[PDB]
């Protein structure tokens, strides 16, 4: 009986950011096994799942992980101990029952992801095969083109800039390899100007710079002279530009209006859902954009559905909040035709089976669906292996500075090296939810 | 080493129908084992890949393969011989290679399927696991809704009907074990009928009936009959209908017209294609009709746009010989708004490799891909593993009667006895290119 | 204790025809495997084994095998398990107890069978040798000469014909290979004639036609034709004919007499058994025949000893109903001079210990035995094993088109194939109850 | 022959920072697996060991490492396959004598140690044990105490402070794991007091803050502020605070003076060597200093002197530019009494065999051995296995913000759980060069 589990354990670790997180282990008979650690998020006032904290401030401020650790150890260990490596989705599904609430409070969503990774993971150990193989079959083939953060607003800056983070695509080049190079070539431009102009060059959370920048659109065009100093073009036979908005913050529920007097000065505007829409237009028509998160309130569906008829057929739009990788309210945008692109977070739903789910379904209806990191991150390296398991793309996997971002490029790296000439790399031919 | 082929071998054997095919063998170094045998199908005048034969007339009328044996045994063999059995891209795009034409026509699709088949068999022996979780990863959970022949006409029959052939699907039914029972219920009490009238009860190719009607409105009154003499209901919550034109075998080349008087008698009608769009229309109308098969001819481009735009968003149409199962062709009709399906048929293309590619392409697209069967078949069950192995929610293999059928229906009683509690049938869920 | 069972399973299945039927597992401790599924047949008033069938009209019209399986699943297994997987008639010994009625009635035949058949190919793949090298010992090495069906009657026909199938042989051929592809162009031959005579050219359940003749000597002339249109000789020589007339039908016990009127019209005769002996030795001066399969009632012995005076230095003389496989009625039959050759069908009799018994008593008494299949059938190949393991000479397995009838002849050309320059093929020197 | 290196292979990856490294892998026989990647740092004006580097302006800024990836693929693989993997003497002491220059610039230095720690990690895999056990045999048992990074200065800040860097140590602390969570309690409540003063919050290449304070007293006094605010003592109790001069940068080497000017007002001090120790006493008088590294000019032997007769039973006295980590170097400041510490960089030397001579030539002469890091890095944790398999009871490896600092923190909670009850932490007790 080589394949059954004979034990599952857990202990308390740090992120990135230095805050307390979860990690769990796997064993088999044959001495086969797996480590799974979950990185860090948590949310109130929505229908995503929850974590488990400790609330006792004597340790580290209340956040620590012990009631997760005592749940592995003490309850889910007991029921999944004699189970086969192999059954994924009998066990993730056991789990589910385990748990018995809607949104995985009496477990936490924290403890049951970390099972459920460290499983997979022990399970392509005693097969075998490397993990995007196991996950995906045998077409498992193409490398994503990366979405990658280098400029810093609103919440995040104390600059007189409205959106969240500003980003560079490296669509025309003709591999995977070359543009991580033409990446890492515009992140050194950049530096050398802000240097030059007298500018803080330190960085934040997802290891991109947040200057006192005059106002959204100098961010903008200092983006484009550094693409240019660097010696590419702007523009589809090159590299393009995308914003996160993330719109739900500035917007005035009592008013029913967006106003950019929070982020921006006592001068600034307010605007309607038709002004935001006009807004986001002009925007469009004078730089090279290629795609929109967010730019629209989580709950202005009218919106979304104005919004999708004026600029879906040019640009993407992506859910993010308005989703939270959830199917239920998937299945009414699809229907409604709000929106042609998702991003997937594997923490806010908790298990690998329902992650694989949703993609399926979104890409049925013809959309997009890129895989992202949060912000406090992990040595983890496990979602480069699902955006290549499923053939899916794009990936949202942050700036090139620190080693929580790094590591996952150096995975991507050693994958492109493996598949050699079965190896494909799509550029601008990545967008079917465009191109229609 | 143990995971190295070792030795690939190749024989002559029968079809049903009593033809001469092919088959093959392959091993590992460990003793892992598979055997491949290729459906008999070739046609003229569109660019399917093309079967090696024997011209010799002495033998078999000329429909001899031993020819195509010989080059899998003194070329393809030690070519292969040396690579790992997990491997499956790789060797496939050897061989396509090694041969070095378009059509695949100096070595034999035949031949390049035979070995292509074989070696996934080895594969899922080598790592002691079922066809469907090494073909499509751990995420394999869905039955496909079976659509199944009854009754024939057009150049399958003598009566006066133009259409080749009618389908029944169980679309109301909670388990596919309930569906099968269903389907052999309402093929009994058809029997039953046609024997008090008089009719013929011996049986075609698919093992369906093909008796003397009068006309096509006989033909579908007589199925409607059986429906509640079963005790089932017609429509979406129970029993729906469906055709098969092959509308290229009356279709005028030269008139540009589609003319009847082919297969009905002398005084039926002579339709242009907005005539064409008018009678369909007027049976759907009238019937409990679901889907479609190659309604326009091959080349009537024009006219799959106005059957698309009139009928599209009702009722599923199917491309098969608009598509051939090319990539080229599907590729066009996407640009174009000209269907909303394939039909796909393995041993048209020649690889498992390009399979796979054109079910993907269909689902970005919002297409349903239907996996399909020939006329000659044999004792094989892989298309059953396809159908599960992608999640594709339908299946077309043929009638209620002839072991060359019962063989590809048993399989799948089988994969829902082992997924269990996990396992899925949608019922009209399935078209998720209309209910939008 | 690699070789001990560790469990054995049945489910539910179909058969050719749409009807349920059963399937059965086993398994070793060391992970050795065996299927074995059951052809279909019943009988009543007679000394054959009997099957279950659930009679519950609410599904499959009462014909399910349901109780079959809950004693397979509730009571063999549990008796089973801890046999070594080789005591093949120890274990068939302790089911007939365990039963313990003369005919199986309380488990059911079918149920037992099953079990009988998965054990011996379970114990094959643990010793690692070919099916017929388990069951024969290493004299394995005739390939069995066929008698295929091409045209039906009596009960099987709308035609004004008594006798219910007709077959050919092709006794001439140099090989087994070469033989398969004599039977094969004849087929192809006839069907040609019919479509020039305006005739049906569809099939039945053992795959052959049934054309409305004018009589039993068109019947008989159109098959000749058929023969000369291919290019070969009819007698010795070439290919000749055989009948099984099923005589038991057209019997009438209360006149003592047989009556044509029943399949043919108000003008055909009345014959006694004396003018039955001389009717069919009028057909033996005619025509190539070489066989002939009943030809009087299950109980005119009296008539069976006239009979096999008259003509059993001459021709072959076969019984089916009237021995039933059963020992007993053998015995009395070898004892009274009443047959030269018997029928095999597993599943009337129930294990293969009693099948393996019954040919070994046929042989010494110097008559001929004949391996059948059933109307109904499985993708199972086992009975063209037992033909080679035996080295019996002669197999009864249909016609040239359908998958349950072709799958037995592809088996054998694997066979001749192993067994390379040690096979052998005896043609008309097969027939050692004449040529004595 | 299981033990035997049939294979090693090199890549090109990047570190942190986001630039070019490299990347080994070697393999058993056995199918034993290791995998090594090396930090990137080089200097210049010193006997530090030469890294290779592709001289070409258009990658990467002339930063590319194809050259030395091509000296292992092409030299040193052919050099070291068929060795046993257990051998590191001879291995390392083999690449030495191949590359045959004192400052290994033949082959380069980062080529060779990439083969040097990869070796080590299949070893400890093929004998099934811990890395820490398999370095340093069966008595490890002393977790390190950490001096972690908090504030900046000199020329890694634009504040006007000459000094490079300020560290916290918690040597009042029973367990490690209550050390970490002393220093992230503190990390926090810094962060409170910066935001409350109107400073940035941003973090430099090791993940501590840099803002513009008015000079050294400041920063001083606002980490004590701190340590009051989460609630420990400063002194031996509780927390200890530590200096790192890079002094060389502002010493003037044709004056012979220490020169404040240059990262400090136009009216600061010019200092003579006497006065230098003066100023440093005059620090430590004040403040709980426990540590100073880099005190004194790399050149000035005499000022060495002077600041050792003065200071050095009070306080550690740490070599790191003054020794390289060079046994030439060390031995003369044994001799001469010039220091009571060594900082010891791994990829200085170039083999783990010369790493551990001159760690135990330091244990000889009554001085601390102290592992560190370099600038850029990578999210390999080898140097927290080198620190338990020595006994030696100090690391310098960073803040607690960066996964490239936070996963060589997350590897010594790993070891404390598992060496258990048999676990130490010294604290205070570990400057055995002191409190004598």
Redesign the interface.
């Known amino acids: 009986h080589m394949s059954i589990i004979t034990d599952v354990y857990a202990?308390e670790?740090?992120?990135?950011?230095?805050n307390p997180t979860l990690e769990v282990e796997v064993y088999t008979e044959s001495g086969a096994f797996g480590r799974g650690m979950v990185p860090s998020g948590a949310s109130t006032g929505e229908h995503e799942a929850v974590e488990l904290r400790d609330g006792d401030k004597s340790?580290?401020?209340g956040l620590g992980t012990q009631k997760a650790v005592d749940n592995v150890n003490n309850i889910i260990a007991e029921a999944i101990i004699g189970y086969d490596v192999?059954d994924?989705?009998?066990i993730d599904?056991a789990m589910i029952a385990l748990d018995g609430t809607p949104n995985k409070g009496k477990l936490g969503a924290n403890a049951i992801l970390g099972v459920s990774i460290a499983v997979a993971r022990a399970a392509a150990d005693y097969?075998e095969?490397p993990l995007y193989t196991?996950?995906?079959?045998?077409?498992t083939?193409v490398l994503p083109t990366p979405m990658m953060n280098i400029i810093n607003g609103g919440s995040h800056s104390d600059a007189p800039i409205a959106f969240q983070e500003f980003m560079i695509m490296p669509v025309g080049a003709p591999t995977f390899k070359e543009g991580?190079?033409w990446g890492?070539?515009v992140?050194?431009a950049l530096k050398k100007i802000l240097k030059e102009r007298g500018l803080?060059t330190?960085?934040?959370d997802e290891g991109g710079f947040?200057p006192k920048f005059e106002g959204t659109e100098d961010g903008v065009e200092t983006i484009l002279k550094a693409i240019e100093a660097a010696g590419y073009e702007a523009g589809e036979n090159g590299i393009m530009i995308g914003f996160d908005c993330a719109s739900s913050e500035f917007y005035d529920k009592e008013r029913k209006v967006y106003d950019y007097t929070k982020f921006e000065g006592e001068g600034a505007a307010v605007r309607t859902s038709a002004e935001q829409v006009d807004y986001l237009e002009e925007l469009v028509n004078k730089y090279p954009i290629i795609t929109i998160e967010d730019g629209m309130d989580e709950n202005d569906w009218d919106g979304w559905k104005v919004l999708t008829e004026r600029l879906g057929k040019r640009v993407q739009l992506v859910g993010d909040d308005f989703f939270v990788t959830n199917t239920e309210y998937l299945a009414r945008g699809i229907?409604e035709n709000a929106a042609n692109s998702i991003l997937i977070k594997v923490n806010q739903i908790g298990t690998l089976?329902e992650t694989?789910?949703a993609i399926?379904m979104a890409?049925?209806?013809?959309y997009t669906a890129v895989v992202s990191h949060r912000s406090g991150?992990?040595?983890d390296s496990t979602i480069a292996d699902i955006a290549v398991?499923t053939?899916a793309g794009q990936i949202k996997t942050g700036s090139?500075?620190?080693?929580?971002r790094?590591?996952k490029?150096?995975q991507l790296?050693?994958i492109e090296?493996q598949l050699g000439?079965?190896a494909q790399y799509k550029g601008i031919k990545s967008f079917?939810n465009l191109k229609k």
Do not use: C, M, P, W
């Open positions: 202990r670790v740090l992120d990135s950011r230095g340790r580290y401020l192999r994924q989705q009998a599904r097969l095969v196991y996950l995906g079959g045998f077409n083939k991580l190079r890492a070539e992140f050194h803080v330190a960085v934040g947040a229907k089976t694989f789910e399926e890409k049925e209806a013809g991150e992990t040595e398991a053939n090139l500075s620190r080693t929580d790094i590591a490029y150096n790296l050693r090296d000439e079965v079917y």
